[PDB]
Amino acid sequence: MNKKNILPQQGQPVIRLTAGQLSSQLAELSEEAL
C-alpha cells in the first residue's frame, strides 16, 4: 500500500515529465532567435 511512484487517475505529471526531459536537452542549447 504505497502511492509514492504510483500516480492516480491524474497522470498529469507523466505528460510534463515526458516532454520535459526532451525540452530539457534543448533548454541547454536554447534557440537564440526572436
Backbone as XML, in Angstrom:
<?xml version="1.0"?>
<chain id="A" units="angstrom">
  <residue number="1" name="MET">
    <atom name="N" x="0.841" y="-1.225" z="0.000"/>
    <atom name="CA" x="0.000" y="0.000" z="0.000"/>
    <atom name="C" x="0.864" y="1.258" z="0.000"/>
  </residue>
  <residue number="2" name="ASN">
    <atom name="N" x="1.298" y="1.670" z="-1.187"/>
    <atom name="CA" x="2.130" y="2.861" z="-1.328"/>
    <atom name="C" x="1.713" y="3.670" z="-2.552"/>
  </residue>
  <residue number="3" name="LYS">
    <atom name="N" x="1.831" y="4.990" z="-2.451"/>
    <atom name="CA" x="1.466" y="5.877" z="-3.549"/>
    <atom name="C" x="2.537" y="6.940" z="-3.773"/>
  </residue>
  <residue number="4" name="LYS">
    <atom name="N" x="3.796" y="6.517" z="-3.743"/>
    <atom name="CA" x="4.915" y="7.430" z="-3.942"/>
    <atom name="C" x="5.258" y="7.557" z="-5.423"/>
  </residue>
  <residue number="5" name="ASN">
    <atom name="N" x="5.258" y="6.427" z="-6.125"/>
    <atom name="CA" x="5.569" y="6.411" z="-7.550"/>
    <atom name="C" x="4.337" y="6.049" z="-8.372"/>
  </residue>
  <residue number="6" name="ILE">
    <atom name="N" x="3.316" y="5.526" z="-7.699"/>
    <atom name="CA" x="2.081" y="5.132" z="-8.364"/>
    <atom name="C" x="1.087" y="6.289" z="-8.415"/>
  </residue>
  <residue number="7" name="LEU">
    <atom name="N" x="1.088" y="7.017" z="-9.528"/>
    <atom name="CA" x="0.180" y="8.145" z="-9.703"/>
    <atom name="C" x="-1.261" y="7.657" z="-9.844"/>
  </residue>
  <residue number="8" name="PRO">
    <atom name="N" x="-2.246" y="8.506" z="-9.496"/>
    <atom name="CA" x="-3.653" y="8.152" z="-9.587"/>
    <atom name="C" x="-4.219" y="8.358" z="-10.987"/>
  </residue>
  <residue number="9" name="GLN">
    <atom name="N" x="-5.508" y="8.660" z="-11.061"/>
    <atom name="CA" x="-6.175" y="8.883" z="-12.333"/>
    <atom name="C" x="-5.699" y="10.168" z="-12.989"/>
  </residue>
  <residue number="10" name="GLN">
    <atom name="N" x="-4.758" y="10.811" z="-12.332"/>
    <atom name="CA" x="-4.191" y="12.063" z="-12.813"/>
    <atom name="C" x="-3.310" y="11.837" z="-14.039"/>
  </residue>
  <residue number="11" name="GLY">
    <atom name="N" x="-2.071" y="11.406" z="-13.809"/>
    <atom name="CA" x="-1.155" y="11.165" z="-14.911"/>
    <atom name="C" x="-0.701" y="12.446" z="-15.574"/>
  </residue>
  <residue number="12" name="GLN">
    <atom name="N" x="-1.057" y="13.564" z="-14.963"/>
    <atom name="CA" x="-0.702" y="14.873" z="-15.472"/>
    <atom name="C" x="0.814" y="15.087" z="-15.537"/>
  </residue>
  <residue number="13" name="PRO">
    <atom name="N" x="1.539" y="14.747" z="-14.458"/>
    <atom name="CA" x="2.993" y="14.916" z="-14.376"/>
    <atom name="C" x="3.734" y="13.930" z="-15.264"/>
  </residue>
  <residue number="14" name="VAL">
    <atom name="N" x="2.996" y="12.969" z="-15.803"/>
    <atom name="CA" x="3.574" y="11.979" z="-16.695"/>
    <atom name="C" x="3.710" y="12.577" z="-18.088"/>
  </residue>
  <residue number="15" name="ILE">
    <atom name="N" x="2.942" y="13.636" z="-18.335"/>
    <atom name="CA" x="2.968" y="14.324" z="-19.616"/>
    <atom name="C" x="3.952" y="15.482" z="-19.574"/>
  </residue>
  <residue number="16" name="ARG">
    <atom name="N" x="4.170" y="15.993" z="-18.372"/>
    <atom name="CA" x="5.100" y="17.096" z="-18.159"/>
    <atom name="C" x="6.516" y="16.564" z="-18.155"/>
  </residue>
  <residue number="17" name="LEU">
    <atom name="N" x="6.678" y="15.442" z="-17.476"/>
    <atom name="CA" x="7.971" y="14.777" z="-17.371"/>
    <atom name="C" x="8.447" y="14.304" z="-18.736"/>
  </residue>
  <residue number="18" name="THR">
    <atom name="N" x="7.535" y="13.717" z="-19.501"/>
    <atom name="CA" x="7.853" y="13.225" z="-20.827"/>
    <atom name="C" x="8.449" y="14.333" z="-21.689"/>
  </residue>
  <residue number="19" name="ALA">
    <atom name="N" x="7.606" y="15.274" z="-22.098"/>
    <atom name="CA" x="8.054" y="16.388" z="-22.919"/>
    <atom name="C" x="9.042" y="17.254" z="-22.154"/>
  </residue>
  <residue number="20" name="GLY">
    <atom name="N" x="9.100" y="17.043" z="-20.844"/>
    <atom name="CA" x="10.003" y="17.798" z="-20.009"/>
    <atom name="C" x="11.445" y="17.383" z="-20.196"/>
  </residue>
  <residue number="21" name="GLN">
    <atom name="N" x="11.660" y="16.080" z="-20.276"/>
    <atom name="CA" x="13.002" y="15.533" z="-20.459"/>
    <atom name="C" x="13.593" y="15.986" z="-21.789"/>
  </residue>
  <residue number="22" name="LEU">
    <atom name="N" x="12.779" y="15.931" z="-22.838"/>
    <atom name="CA" x="13.214" y="16.337" z="-24.167"/>
    <atom name="C" x="13.419" y="17.846" z="-24.233"/>
  </residue>
  <residue number="23" name="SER">
    <atom name="N" x="12.483" y="18.594" z="-23.653"/>
    <atom name="CA" x="12.569" y="20.045" z="-23.645"/>
    <atom name="C" x="13.671" y="20.518" z="-22.711"/>
  </residue>
  <residue number="24" name="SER">
    <atom name="N" x="14.341" y="19.560" z="-22.097"/>
    <atom name="CA" x="15.436" y="19.842" z="-21.185"/>
    <atom name="C" x="16.757" y="19.787" z="-21.935"/>
  </residue>
  <residue number="25" name="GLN">
    <atom name="N" x="16.865" y="18.810" z="-22.828"/>
    <atom name="CA" x="18.062" y="18.634" z="-23.636"/>
    <atom name="C" x="18.226" y="19.797" z="-24.610"/>
  </residue>
  <residue number="26" name="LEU">
    <atom name="N" x="17.152" y="20.562" z="-24.792"/>
    <atom name="CA" x="17.172" y="21.707" z="-25.685"/>
    <atom name="C" x="17.376" y="22.993" z="-24.905"/>
  </residue>
  <residue number="27" name="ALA">
    <atom name="N" x="16.840" y="23.031" z="-23.689"/>
    <atom name="CA" x="16.981" y="24.200" z="-22.834"/>
    <atom name="C" x="18.439" y="24.634" z="-22.783"/>
  </residue>
  <residue number="28" name="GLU">
    <atom name="N" x="19.318" y="23.663" z="-22.555"/>
    <atom name="CA" x="20.747" y="23.913" z="-22.500"/>
    <atom name="C" x="21.230" y="24.616" z="-23.761"/>
  </residue>
  <residue number="29" name="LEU">
    <atom name="N" x="20.658" y="24.224" z="-24.899"/>
    <atom name="CA" x="21.019" y="24.814" z="-26.180"/>
    <atom name="C" x="19.863" y="25.648" z="-26.708"/>
  </residue>
  <residue number="30" name="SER">
    <atom name="N" x="19.228" y="26.382" z="-25.800"/>
    <atom name="CA" x="18.093" y="27.223" z="-26.137"/>
    <atom name="C" x="18.324" y="27.979" z="-27.442"/>
  </residue>
  <residue number="31" name="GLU">
    <atom name="N" x="17.375" y="27.852" z="-28.364"/>
    <atom name="CA" x="17.470" y="28.520" z="-29.657"/>
    <atom name="C" x="17.399" y="30.035" z="-29.492"/>
  </residue>
  <residue number="32" name="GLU">
    <atom name="N" x="18.491" y="30.712" z="-29.836"/>
    <atom name="CA" x="18.556" y="32.164" z="-29.728"/>
    <atom name="C" x="18.041" y="32.827" z="-31.001"/>
  </residue>
  <residue number="33" name="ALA">
    <atom name="N" x="16.727" y="33.006" z="-31.078"/>
    <atom name="CA" x="16.105" y="33.627" z="-32.241"/>
    <atom name="C" x="14.707" y="34.135" z="-31.909"/>
  </residue>
  <residue number="34" name="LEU">
    <atom name="N" x="14.560" y="35.455" z="-31.859"/>
    <atom name="CA" x="13.274" y="36.073" z="-31.553"/>
    <atom name="C" x="12.886" y="37.079" z="-32.633"/>
  </residue>
</chain>
